[PDB]
Amino acid sequence: GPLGSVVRAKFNFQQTNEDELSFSKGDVIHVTRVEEGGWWEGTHNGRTGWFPSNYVREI
């Protein structure tokens, strides 16, 4: 499943909330939480946060 998966940002995403994970296309993200609704939580490098699940793709 996506939980615990490693995905890659397909598009740049700029957080709109402090708990969101900004990232650039190509960024590798570790999915740490999956919720239905368009957002997952995960980490990229030293950052953590929610991000649009449709902004990433499985590697």
């Binding site: 598009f11 740049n12 995403f13 709109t16 909330n17 402090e18 708990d19 969101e20 919720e35 239905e36 609704g37 368009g38 957002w39 939580e41 929610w50 649009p52 449709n54 902004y55």
Partner: peptide, 18 residues
């Protein structure tokens, strides 16, 4: 870029500050 759904409440916490 793709459409970003509004943050669902079930993904929010007191840390969901804008």
């Amino acid at each position: 870029p793709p459409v970003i759904a509004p943050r669902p409440e079930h993904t929010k916490s007191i840390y969901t500050r804008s």
